[PDB]
Subunit: 130 residues, 4 copies
Amino acid sequence: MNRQELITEALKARDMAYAPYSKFQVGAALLTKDGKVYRGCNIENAAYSMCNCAEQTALFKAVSEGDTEFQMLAVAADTPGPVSPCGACRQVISELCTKDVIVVLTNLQGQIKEMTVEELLPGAFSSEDL
Amino acid sequence: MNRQELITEALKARDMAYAPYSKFQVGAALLTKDGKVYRGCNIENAAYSMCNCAEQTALFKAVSEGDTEFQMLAVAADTPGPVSPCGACRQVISELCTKDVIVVLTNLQGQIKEMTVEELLPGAFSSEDL
Amino acid sequence: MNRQELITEALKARDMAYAPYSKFQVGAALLTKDGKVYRGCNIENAAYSMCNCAEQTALFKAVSEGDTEFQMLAVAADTPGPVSPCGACRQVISELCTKDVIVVLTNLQGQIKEMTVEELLPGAFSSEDL
Amino acid sequence: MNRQELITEALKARDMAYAPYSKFQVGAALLTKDGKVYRGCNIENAAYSMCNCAEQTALFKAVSEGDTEFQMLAVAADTPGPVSPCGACRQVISELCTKDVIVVLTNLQGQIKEMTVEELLPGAFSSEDL
Ligand SMILES: O=C1CCN(C2C[C@H](O)[C@@H](CO)O2)C(=O)N1
Ligand SMILES: O=C1CCN(C2C[C@H](O)[C@@H](CO)O2)C(=O)N1
Ligand SMILES: O=C1CCN(C2C[C@H](O)[C@@H](CO)O2)C(=O)N1
Ligand SMILES: O=C1CCN(C2C[C@H](O)[C@@H](CO)O2)C(=O)N1
Ligand SMILES: [Zn+2]
Ligand SMILES: [Zn+2]
Ligand SMILES: [Zn+2]
Ligand SMILES: [Zn+2]
């Protein structure tokens, strides 16, 4: 399961998205240490604040299943450049993923940006601060 | 899959909860028309606003899998009376579940409150309002 | 400061709304025991989950100023019937407002629905449950 | 209104915080181009996902008043090092503040970290992506 394969997973996950308000579909694919893949997509709501992002859907699914050891996360959307996870998502990622987990960002035209969880949100607010 | 059985599902789902901040674990079990059960649990974050509830975890998992037809939702937590879904959850439920879906609320002592999605949040803000 | 006057406050507050994504402007006016009025409006974000509602804006402003004793809350939007506070808002209202506070809901055509905070979200999840 | 003076504003704002759940109070002070200061503090809820951060409180207050031109934002909390805005906050900041706005982070022991809005969340998901 290389990153190109994980990207295809995210691309398929994107088609399951429920985004009738923004018409902006996003897909994510989370790869565990054991090699299992969890797909995620954004799910919207008439009350915009309740919208859930693809990255969080994938992470929530994994964690709810008992999987907490990850190695890579791929995210895709039809944006100009590689899709940029929103701040809230980066925060969730920084909590549920270890600092060296690889985050692969891409769009629907082959643009690819790779970075670690640490780089995604340097010095992220954490439990240690509490 | 009667409600008592769906409640046991929620009780097991509760044990998967990631809630180190509140120490308040919640579990949810969503039953589809076809009879499939999706388990959910709350997942917290150092940044409290990023916490995700059990009900939403279950619904997000189902929807991401292509399942959008539900018949019942069970929720459980160690509260004095039947657990009360927070407002945000009721909003998500009102969007992803049809009005007559049955919502079963309970705690860890056999208290049970049953109501429909409509009753859970009467006249909920919806797409029609937009 | 009767309810009709508080409604006009909410109607003016609505014009300050920053909602370029939904194009759905909402206004709110919070009246304290001492008679002070706090205006609120929805403020959106490209990342939909970060959108903040009018009711919350008004309540956050008041509380940040040291005002925590309220008597009435008015909310207005261009909806078919009286605007319905989203679940997340009802949850915040239920925490920051005592159960006797009067909530006045209306649209831009004279439709008015009045109810207490308790009625807005009966048996709302609260600190007592934690 | 230099940064040291804006920091004192944030320190005072912090005392207004409503955070009975985390017992973690945060303060923020937003300075407009015209020199006006808006104070903010975190406001919690029994349902953790509804918690609002200091930075957002200050920004929401300003915007609701018609002020949309800012020059600096100060944030303070009792953390080991300068307080780190959570991802959700950085996202809101990136939307409501121009990229040149200065963000001043500090704790209660004189540690100070200064950076621009762009640096706070480089390549932040924005309307252009939609
Ligand atoms: O973090 C990324 C960027 C944002 N989108 C979302 C949520 C929402 O339904 C839509 C518009 O913000 O894209 C995601 O799903 N993931
Ligand atoms: O709607 C219900 C009530 C609230 N809890 C949550 C989220 C959070 O982790 C914790 C404290 O609010 O319980 C749920 O998970 N579901
Ligand atoms: O609770 C009410 C209903 C929802 N709207 C919002 C937030 C968002 O910007 C827009 C669409 O959901 O209306 C409010 O501002 N208040
Ligand atoms: O972005 C910063 C970091 C997080 N805190 C919050 C919200 C919540 O009440 C508490 C614990 O997450 O600190 C803030 O208020 N601002
Ligand atoms: Zn996101
Ligand atoms: Zn909830
Ligand atoms: Zn709302
Ligand atoms: Zn924050």
